[PDB]
PDB file of C-alpha atoms (C1' of nucleotides) and ligand atoms in Angstrom:
ATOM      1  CA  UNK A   1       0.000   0.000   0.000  1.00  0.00           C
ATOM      2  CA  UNK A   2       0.821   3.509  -0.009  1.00  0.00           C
ATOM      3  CA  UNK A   3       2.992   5.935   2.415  1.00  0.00           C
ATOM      4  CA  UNK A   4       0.278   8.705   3.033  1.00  0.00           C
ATOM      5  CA  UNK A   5      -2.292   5.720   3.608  1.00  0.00           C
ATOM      6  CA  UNK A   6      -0.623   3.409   5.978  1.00  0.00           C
ATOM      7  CA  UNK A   7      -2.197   2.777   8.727  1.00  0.00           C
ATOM      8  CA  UNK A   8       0.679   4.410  10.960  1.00  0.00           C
ATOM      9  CA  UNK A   9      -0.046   8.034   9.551  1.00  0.00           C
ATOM     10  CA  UNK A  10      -3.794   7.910  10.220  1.00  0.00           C
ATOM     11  CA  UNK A  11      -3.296  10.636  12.665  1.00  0.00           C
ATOM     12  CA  UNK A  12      -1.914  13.118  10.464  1.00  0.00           C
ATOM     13  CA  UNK A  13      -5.465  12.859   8.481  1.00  0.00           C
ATOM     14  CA  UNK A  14      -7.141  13.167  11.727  1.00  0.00           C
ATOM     15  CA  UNK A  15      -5.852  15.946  12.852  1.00  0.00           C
ATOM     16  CA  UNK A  16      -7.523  17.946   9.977  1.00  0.00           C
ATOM     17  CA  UNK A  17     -10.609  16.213  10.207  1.00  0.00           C
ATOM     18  CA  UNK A  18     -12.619  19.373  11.500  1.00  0.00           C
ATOM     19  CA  UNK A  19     -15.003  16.560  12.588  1.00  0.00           C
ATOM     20  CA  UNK A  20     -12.638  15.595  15.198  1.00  0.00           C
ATOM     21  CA  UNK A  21     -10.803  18.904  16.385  1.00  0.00           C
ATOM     22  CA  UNK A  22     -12.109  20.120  19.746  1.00  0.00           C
ATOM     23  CA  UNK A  23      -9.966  22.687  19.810  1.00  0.00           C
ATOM     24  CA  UNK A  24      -7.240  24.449  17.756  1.00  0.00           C
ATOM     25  CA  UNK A  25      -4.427  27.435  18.098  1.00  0.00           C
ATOM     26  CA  UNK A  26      -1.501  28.755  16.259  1.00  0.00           C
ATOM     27  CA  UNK A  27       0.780  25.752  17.670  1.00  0.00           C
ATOM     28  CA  UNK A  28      -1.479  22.810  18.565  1.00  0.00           C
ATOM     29  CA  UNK A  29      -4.599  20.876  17.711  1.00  0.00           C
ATOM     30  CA  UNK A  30      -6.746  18.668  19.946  1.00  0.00           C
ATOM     31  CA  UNK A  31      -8.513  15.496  18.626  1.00  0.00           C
ATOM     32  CA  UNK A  32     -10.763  12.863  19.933  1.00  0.00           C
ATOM     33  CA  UNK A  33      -8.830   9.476  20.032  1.00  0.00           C
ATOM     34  CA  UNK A  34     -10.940   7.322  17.597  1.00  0.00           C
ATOM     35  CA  UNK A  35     -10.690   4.540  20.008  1.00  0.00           C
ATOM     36  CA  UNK A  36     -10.832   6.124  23.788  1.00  0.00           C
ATOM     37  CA  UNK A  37      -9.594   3.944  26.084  1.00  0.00           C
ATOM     38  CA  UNK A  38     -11.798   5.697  28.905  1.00  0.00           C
ATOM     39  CA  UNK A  39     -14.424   7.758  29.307  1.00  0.00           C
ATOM     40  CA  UNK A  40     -12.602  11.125  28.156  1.00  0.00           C
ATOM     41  CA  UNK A  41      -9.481  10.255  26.107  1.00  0.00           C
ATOM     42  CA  UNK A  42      -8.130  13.176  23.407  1.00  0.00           C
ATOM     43  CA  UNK A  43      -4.582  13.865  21.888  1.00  0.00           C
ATOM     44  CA  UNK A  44      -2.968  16.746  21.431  1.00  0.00           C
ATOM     45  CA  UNK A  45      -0.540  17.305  18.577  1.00  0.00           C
ATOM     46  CA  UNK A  46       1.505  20.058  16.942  1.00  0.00           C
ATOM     47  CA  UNK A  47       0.923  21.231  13.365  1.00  0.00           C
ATOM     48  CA  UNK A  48       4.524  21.256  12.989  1.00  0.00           C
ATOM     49  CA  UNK A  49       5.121  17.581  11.960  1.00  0.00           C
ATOM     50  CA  UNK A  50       7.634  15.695  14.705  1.00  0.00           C
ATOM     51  CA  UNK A  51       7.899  11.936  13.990  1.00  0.00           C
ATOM     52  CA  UNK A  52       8.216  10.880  17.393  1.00  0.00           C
ATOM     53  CA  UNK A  53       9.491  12.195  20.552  1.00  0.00           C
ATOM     54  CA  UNK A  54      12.731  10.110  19.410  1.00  0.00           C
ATOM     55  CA  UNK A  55      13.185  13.662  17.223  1.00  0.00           C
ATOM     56  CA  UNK A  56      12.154  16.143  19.972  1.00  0.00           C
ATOM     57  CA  UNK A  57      15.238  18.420  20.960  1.00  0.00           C
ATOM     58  CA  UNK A  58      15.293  22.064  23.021  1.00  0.00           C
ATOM     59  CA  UNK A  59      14.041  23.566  20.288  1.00  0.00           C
ATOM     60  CA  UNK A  60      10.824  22.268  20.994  1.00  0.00           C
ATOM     61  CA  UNK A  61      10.328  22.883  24.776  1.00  0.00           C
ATOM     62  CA  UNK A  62       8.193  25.449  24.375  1.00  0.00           C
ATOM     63  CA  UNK A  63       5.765  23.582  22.445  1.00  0.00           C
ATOM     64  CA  UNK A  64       6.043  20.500  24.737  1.00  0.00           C
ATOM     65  CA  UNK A  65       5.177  22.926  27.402  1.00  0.00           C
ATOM     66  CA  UNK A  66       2.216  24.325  25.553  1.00  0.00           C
ATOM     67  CA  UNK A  67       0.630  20.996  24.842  1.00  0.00           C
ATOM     68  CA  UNK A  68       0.560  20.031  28.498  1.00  0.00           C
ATOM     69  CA  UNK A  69      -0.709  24.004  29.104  1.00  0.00           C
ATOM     70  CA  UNK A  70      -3.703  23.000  26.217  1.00  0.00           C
ATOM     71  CA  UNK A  71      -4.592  19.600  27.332  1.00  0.00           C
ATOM     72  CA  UNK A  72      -5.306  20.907  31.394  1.00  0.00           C
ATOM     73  CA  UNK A  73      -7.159  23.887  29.606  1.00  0.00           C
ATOM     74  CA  UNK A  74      -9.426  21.103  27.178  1.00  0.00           C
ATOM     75  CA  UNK A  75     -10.057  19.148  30.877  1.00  0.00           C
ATOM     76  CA  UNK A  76     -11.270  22.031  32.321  1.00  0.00           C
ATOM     77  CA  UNK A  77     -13.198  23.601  29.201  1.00  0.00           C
ATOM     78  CA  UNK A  78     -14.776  19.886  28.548  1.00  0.00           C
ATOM     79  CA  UNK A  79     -14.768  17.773  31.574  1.00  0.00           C
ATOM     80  CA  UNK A  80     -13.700  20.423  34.662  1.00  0.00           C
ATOM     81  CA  UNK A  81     -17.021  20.382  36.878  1.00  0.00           C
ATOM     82  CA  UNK A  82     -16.843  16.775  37.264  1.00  0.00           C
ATOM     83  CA  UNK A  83     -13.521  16.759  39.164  1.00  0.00           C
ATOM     84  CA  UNK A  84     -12.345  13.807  37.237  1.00  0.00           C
ATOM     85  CA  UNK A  85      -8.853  12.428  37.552  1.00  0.00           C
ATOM     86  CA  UNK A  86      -7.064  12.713  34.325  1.00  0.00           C
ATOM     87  CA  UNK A  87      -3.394  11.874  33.686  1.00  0.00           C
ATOM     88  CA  UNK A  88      -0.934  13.599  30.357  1.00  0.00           C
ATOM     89  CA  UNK A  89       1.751  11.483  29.105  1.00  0.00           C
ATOM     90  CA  UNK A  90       3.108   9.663  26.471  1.00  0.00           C
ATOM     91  CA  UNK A  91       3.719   6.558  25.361  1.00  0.00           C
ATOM     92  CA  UNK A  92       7.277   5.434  25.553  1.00  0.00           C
ATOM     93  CA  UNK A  93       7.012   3.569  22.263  1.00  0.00           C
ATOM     94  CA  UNK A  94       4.045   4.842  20.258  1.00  0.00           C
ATOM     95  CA  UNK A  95       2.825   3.234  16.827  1.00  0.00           C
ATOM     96  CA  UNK A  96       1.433   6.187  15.276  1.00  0.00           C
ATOM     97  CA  UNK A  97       3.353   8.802  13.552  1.00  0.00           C
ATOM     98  CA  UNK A  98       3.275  12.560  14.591  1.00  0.00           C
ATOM     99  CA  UNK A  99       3.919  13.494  18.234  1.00  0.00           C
ATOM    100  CA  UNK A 100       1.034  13.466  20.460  1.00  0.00           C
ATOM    101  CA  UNK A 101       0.137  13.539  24.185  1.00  0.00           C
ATOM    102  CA  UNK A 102      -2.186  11.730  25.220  1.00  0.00           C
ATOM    103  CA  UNK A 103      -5.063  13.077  27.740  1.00  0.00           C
ATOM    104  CA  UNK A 104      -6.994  10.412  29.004  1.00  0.00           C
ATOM    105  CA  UNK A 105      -9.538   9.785  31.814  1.00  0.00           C
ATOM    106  CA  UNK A 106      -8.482   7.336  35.016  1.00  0.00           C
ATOM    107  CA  UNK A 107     -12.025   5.537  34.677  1.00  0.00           C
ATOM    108  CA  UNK A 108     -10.648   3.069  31.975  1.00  0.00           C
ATOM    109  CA  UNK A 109     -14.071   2.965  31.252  1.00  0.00           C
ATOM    110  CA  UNK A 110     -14.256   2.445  27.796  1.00  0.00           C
ATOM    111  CA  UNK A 111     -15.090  -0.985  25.387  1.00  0.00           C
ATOM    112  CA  UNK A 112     -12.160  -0.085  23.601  1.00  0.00           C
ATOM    113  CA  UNK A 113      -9.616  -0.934  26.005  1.00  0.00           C
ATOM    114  CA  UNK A 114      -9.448  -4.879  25.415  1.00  0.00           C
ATOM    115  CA  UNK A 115      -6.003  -6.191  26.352  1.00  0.00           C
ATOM    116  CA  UNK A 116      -3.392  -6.334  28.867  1.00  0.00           C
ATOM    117  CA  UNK A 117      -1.282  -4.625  26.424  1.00  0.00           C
ATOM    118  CA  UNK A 118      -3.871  -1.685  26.696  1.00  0.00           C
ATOM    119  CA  UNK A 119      -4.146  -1.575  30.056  1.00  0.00           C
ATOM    120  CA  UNK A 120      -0.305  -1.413  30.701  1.00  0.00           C
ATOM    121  CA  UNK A 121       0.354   1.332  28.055  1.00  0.00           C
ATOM    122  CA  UNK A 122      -1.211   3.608  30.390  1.00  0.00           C
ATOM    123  CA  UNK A 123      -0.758   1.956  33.960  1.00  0.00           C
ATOM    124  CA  UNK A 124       2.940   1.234  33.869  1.00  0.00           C
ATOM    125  CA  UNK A 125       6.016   2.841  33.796  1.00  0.00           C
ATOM    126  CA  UNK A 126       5.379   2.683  29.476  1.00  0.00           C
ATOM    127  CA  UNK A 127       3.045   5.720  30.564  1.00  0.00           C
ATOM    128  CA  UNK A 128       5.803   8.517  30.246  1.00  0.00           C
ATOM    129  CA  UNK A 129       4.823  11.297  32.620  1.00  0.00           C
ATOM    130  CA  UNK A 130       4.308  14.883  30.297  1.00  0.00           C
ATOM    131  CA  UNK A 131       6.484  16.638  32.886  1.00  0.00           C
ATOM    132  CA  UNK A 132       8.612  13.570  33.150  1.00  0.00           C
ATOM    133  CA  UNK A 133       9.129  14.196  29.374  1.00  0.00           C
ATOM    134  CA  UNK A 134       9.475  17.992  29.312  1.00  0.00           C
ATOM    135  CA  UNK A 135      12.020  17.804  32.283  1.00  0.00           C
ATOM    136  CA  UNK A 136      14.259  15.296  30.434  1.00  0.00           C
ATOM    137  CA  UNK A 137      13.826  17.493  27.799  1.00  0.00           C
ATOM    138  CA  UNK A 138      14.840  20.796  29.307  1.00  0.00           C
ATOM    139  CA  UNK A 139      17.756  19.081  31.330  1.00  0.00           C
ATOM    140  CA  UNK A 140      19.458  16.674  29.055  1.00  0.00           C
ATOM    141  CA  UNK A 141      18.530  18.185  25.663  1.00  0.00           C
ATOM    142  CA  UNK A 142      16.699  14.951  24.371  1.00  0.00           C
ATOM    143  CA  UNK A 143      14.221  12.061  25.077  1.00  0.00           C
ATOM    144  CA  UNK A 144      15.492   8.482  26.066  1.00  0.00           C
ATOM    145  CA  UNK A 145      13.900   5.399  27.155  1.00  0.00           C
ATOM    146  CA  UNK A 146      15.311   2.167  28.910  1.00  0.00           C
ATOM    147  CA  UNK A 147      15.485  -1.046  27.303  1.00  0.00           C
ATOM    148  CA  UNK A 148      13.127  -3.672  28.236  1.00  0.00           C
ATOM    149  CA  UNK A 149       9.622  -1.300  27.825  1.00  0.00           C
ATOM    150  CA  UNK A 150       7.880  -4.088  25.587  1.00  0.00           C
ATOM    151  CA  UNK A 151       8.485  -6.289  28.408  1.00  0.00           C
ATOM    152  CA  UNK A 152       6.447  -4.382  30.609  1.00  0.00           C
ATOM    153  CA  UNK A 153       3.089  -4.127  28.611  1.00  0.00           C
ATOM    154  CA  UNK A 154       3.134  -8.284  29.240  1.00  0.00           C
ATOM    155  CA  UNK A 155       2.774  -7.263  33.190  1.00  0.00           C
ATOM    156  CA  UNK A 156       0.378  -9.238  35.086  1.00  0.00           C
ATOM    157  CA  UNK A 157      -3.236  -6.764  35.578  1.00  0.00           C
ATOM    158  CA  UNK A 158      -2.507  -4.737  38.402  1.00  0.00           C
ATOM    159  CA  UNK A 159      -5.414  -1.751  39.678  1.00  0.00           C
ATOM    160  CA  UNK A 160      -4.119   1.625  39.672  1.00  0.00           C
ATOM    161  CA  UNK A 161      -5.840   2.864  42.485  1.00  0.00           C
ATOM    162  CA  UNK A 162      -5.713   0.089  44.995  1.00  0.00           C
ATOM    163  CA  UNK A 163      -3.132  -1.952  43.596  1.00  0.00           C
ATOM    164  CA  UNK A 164      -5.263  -5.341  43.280  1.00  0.00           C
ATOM    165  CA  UNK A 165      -4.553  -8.006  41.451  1.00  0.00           C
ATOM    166  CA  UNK A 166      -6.582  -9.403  38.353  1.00  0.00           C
ATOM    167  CA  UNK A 167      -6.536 -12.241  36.495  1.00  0.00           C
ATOM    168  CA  UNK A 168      -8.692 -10.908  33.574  1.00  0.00           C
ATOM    169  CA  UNK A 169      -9.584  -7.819  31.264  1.00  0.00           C
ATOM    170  CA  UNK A 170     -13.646  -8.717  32.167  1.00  0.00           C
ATOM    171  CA  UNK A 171     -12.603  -8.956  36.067  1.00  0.00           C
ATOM    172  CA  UNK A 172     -10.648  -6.139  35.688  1.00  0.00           C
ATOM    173  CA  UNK A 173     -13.462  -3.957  34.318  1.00  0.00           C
ATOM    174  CA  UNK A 174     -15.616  -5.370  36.720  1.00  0.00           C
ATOM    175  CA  UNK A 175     -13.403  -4.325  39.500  1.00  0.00           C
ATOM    176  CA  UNK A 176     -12.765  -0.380  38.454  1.00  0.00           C
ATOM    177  CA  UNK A 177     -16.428  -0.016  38.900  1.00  0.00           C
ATOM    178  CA  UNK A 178     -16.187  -0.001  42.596  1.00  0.00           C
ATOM    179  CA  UNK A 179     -13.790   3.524  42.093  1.00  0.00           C
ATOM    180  CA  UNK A 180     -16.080   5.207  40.873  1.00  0.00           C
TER     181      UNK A 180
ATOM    182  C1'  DG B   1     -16.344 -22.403  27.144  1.00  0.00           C
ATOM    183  C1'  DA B   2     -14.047 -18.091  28.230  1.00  0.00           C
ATOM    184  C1'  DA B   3     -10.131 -15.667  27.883  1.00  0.00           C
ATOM    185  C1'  DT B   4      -5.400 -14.980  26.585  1.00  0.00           C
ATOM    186  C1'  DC B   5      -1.378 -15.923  23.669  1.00  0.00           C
ATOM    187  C1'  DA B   6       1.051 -15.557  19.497  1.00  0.00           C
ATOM    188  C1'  DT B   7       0.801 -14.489  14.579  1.00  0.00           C
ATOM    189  C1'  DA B   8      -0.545 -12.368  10.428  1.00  0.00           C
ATOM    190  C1'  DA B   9      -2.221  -8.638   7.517  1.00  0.00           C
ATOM    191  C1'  DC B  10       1.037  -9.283   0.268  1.00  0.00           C
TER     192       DC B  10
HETATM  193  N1  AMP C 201      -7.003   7.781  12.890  1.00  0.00           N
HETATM  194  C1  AMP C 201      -6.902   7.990  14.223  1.00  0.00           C
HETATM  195  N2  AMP C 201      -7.400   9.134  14.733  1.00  0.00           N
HETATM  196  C2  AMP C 201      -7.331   9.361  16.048  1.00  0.00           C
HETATM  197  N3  AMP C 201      -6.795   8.547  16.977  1.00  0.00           N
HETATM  198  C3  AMP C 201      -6.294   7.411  16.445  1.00  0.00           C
HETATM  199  C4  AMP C 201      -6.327   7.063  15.107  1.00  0.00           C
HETATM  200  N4  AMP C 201      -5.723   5.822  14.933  1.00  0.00           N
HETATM  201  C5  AMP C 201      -5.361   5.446  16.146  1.00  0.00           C
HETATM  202  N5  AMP C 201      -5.720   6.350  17.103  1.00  0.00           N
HETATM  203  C6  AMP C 201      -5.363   6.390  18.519  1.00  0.00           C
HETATM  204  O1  AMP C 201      -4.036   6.872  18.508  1.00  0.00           O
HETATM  205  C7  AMP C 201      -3.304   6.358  19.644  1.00  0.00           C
HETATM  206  C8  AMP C 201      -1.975   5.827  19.179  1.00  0.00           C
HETATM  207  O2  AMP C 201      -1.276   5.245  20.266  1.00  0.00           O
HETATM  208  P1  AMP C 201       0.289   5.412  20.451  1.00  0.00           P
HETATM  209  O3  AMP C 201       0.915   5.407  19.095  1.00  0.00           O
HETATM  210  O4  AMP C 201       0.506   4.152  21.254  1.00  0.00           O
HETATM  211  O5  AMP C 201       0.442   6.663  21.265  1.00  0.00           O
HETATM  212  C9  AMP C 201      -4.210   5.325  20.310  1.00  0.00           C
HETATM  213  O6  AMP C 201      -4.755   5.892  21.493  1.00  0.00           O
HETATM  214  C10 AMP C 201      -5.309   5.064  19.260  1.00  0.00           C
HETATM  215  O7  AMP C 201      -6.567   4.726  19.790  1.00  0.00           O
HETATM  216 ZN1   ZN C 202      -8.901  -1.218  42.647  1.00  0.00          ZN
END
DNA sequence: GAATCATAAC
């Protein structure tokens, strides 16, 4: 198939989609993530095209900064008088092109999430902290990431907010009702 | 049987 329409770029079409924008400025855009893995789950991304934050250097601290700045202000603009618990990171190895930060919900309340592989993108160490990133950033000049991440998505299911341990993605679900 | 694992997608 072709370059423009592999399935890895599908966020760069996105991102214009005015269908799926829920907010827009001179630097960033914010999209819905076509599969949520919770109840509120969007992605912010630059218009300036950044494969990865494998190519992120000083030069864009700024905009790292302003992406974390966009995606508290789409929390509060969208989801704020709920005092919901939301977390901003990144994944430490992504599949999609195009840098984005994720902003995502701590329900996990979604029928997209379906694996342990979901599950421990976001509730592991995998889950790089947005001022975990733009520290590293600021104070060593570039983004790196320990060997041995792929191991951890094969973690056994672990809760986030009490800790428990699961033996299934159904049990699981069942369980985060209770923290609600 | 249900759920996960491990692969494949030409
Ligand atoms: N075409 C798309 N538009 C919007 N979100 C997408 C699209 N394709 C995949 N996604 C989401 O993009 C994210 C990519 O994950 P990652 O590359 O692991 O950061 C996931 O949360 C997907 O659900
Ligand atoms: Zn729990």
């Amino acid at each position: 198939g072709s370059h423009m329409g592999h399935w890895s770029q599908g966020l760069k079409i996105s991102m214009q989609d005015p269908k799926m924008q829920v907010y827009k400025d001179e630097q960033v855009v914010v999209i819905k993530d076509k599969y949520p893995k919770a109840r509120y789950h969007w992605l912010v991304l630059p218009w300036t095209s950044i494969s990865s934050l494998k190519a992120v250097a000083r030069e864009h601290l700024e905009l790292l900064k302003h992406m974390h700045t966009v995606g508290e202000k789409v929390i509060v603009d969208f989801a704020g008088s709920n005092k919901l618990r939301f977390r901003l990171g990144y994944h430490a190895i992504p599949s999609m092109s195009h840098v984005h930060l994720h902003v995502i919900s701590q329900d996990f309340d979604s029928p997209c999430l379906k694996n342990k592989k979901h599950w421990n993108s976001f509730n592991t160490e995998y889950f790089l902290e947005s001022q975990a990133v733009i520290e590293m950033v600021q104070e060593a000049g570039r983004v790196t990431v320990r060997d041995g991440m792929p191991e951890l998505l094969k973690l056994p299911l672990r809760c986030h907010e009490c800790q428990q341990l699961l033996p299934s993605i159904p049990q699981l679900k069942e369980h985060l009702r209770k923290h609600w």
